[PDB]
Design a protein around this ligand. Sequence first.
Ligand code: HG
Ligand code: HG
Ligand code: HG
Ligand code: HG
Lengths: 97, 97, 97, 97
Amino acid sequence: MSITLSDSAAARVNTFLANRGKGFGLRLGVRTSGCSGMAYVLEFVDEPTPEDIVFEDKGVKVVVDGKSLQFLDGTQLDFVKEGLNEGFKFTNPNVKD
Amino acid sequence: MSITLSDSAAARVNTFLANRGKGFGLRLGVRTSGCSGMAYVLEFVDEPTPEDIVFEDKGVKVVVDGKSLQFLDGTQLDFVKEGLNEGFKFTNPNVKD
Amino acid sequence: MSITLSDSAAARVNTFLANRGKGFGLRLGVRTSGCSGMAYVLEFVDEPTPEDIVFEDKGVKVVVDGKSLQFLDGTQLDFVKEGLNEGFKFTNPNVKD
Amino acid sequence: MSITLSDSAAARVNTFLANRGKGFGLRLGVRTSGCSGMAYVLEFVDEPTPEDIVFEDKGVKVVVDGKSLQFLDGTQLDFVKEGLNEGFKFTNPNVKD
Ligand SMILES: [Hg+2]
Ligand SMILES: [Hg+2]
Ligand SMILES: [Hg+2]
Ligand SMILES: [Hg+2]
């Protein structure tokens, strides 16, 4: 859906996919982290399940379990460098720090 | 998403697609009908737009504009024969007659 | 939710509520119209059910069954005069004519 | 919406509200925890904002910012005792450990 990727995230994903030499694209998932928390998940996809929803931003195929689409919509996946750390960052306008 | 197709609807769509000789699959859309009304729309898709979400039920590729996904989720597309009329019927558990 | 009312719709509802002499506010609902269609519904509410969601725009209490919230979100209820007809009009940005 | 409370959570919330001696009810909120994470938030509400959605389970008024409703729907708020720890636990069927 209105899940998007920044230029740097799409480059990064496409880099992983090119070095891997295969793959359909990118899974965005969600999981519990504790009793009052959620963790975002990134995985490679080779084959979408019949439960998956598939879309496109910046020529990247993003795959999301249909059930997880509620928690993920509005997400911008970015890829940022902060100090010694470099990595993906999920943003959502309608969520605060 | 948890949009599904009955056996008869999937047969029917697959029949249209086979006779057409080409096509990716099925677009579900939505449009206004009047001042307090909505009409469901069926179309063939050849190429999904970057705004589209794509999923699968019964080997049929269903394509929905990401913005329309709110109004369509939970829909069962059926294909029924009633009297002299034969045609698609959209059902949703959470909607009444 | 991000269901809103124009000034004219809120005036109109508030007029009905004042003339009625009682009532909590406004129910927005949804129902089938045919085999591929939906009809928007307006009703007065006196008591929200435990299944209802309640919100506020322009000092009007709007009540929506929680299950119907998917089809109604993003709606602007307006109240318009066109020719000899005067009445409520449901709009949604993400829906076309 | 189809946000619910277990018996123990509703008792616990009602206990806090009775000891506080005032208050409308319970705010469920959401916030970032890191770069790929979310944290659930519980607060007392005295006055719902015009941006809030309000509902009811077990005689508890639950208030949610309309924008946060996407991430929170399907949540069961429970209140559990595990070892030395006792506290609220958010569950969602469509989310895994
Ligand atoms: Hg816990
Ligand atoms: Hg009208
Ligand atoms: Hg029909
Ligand atoms: Hg980071």
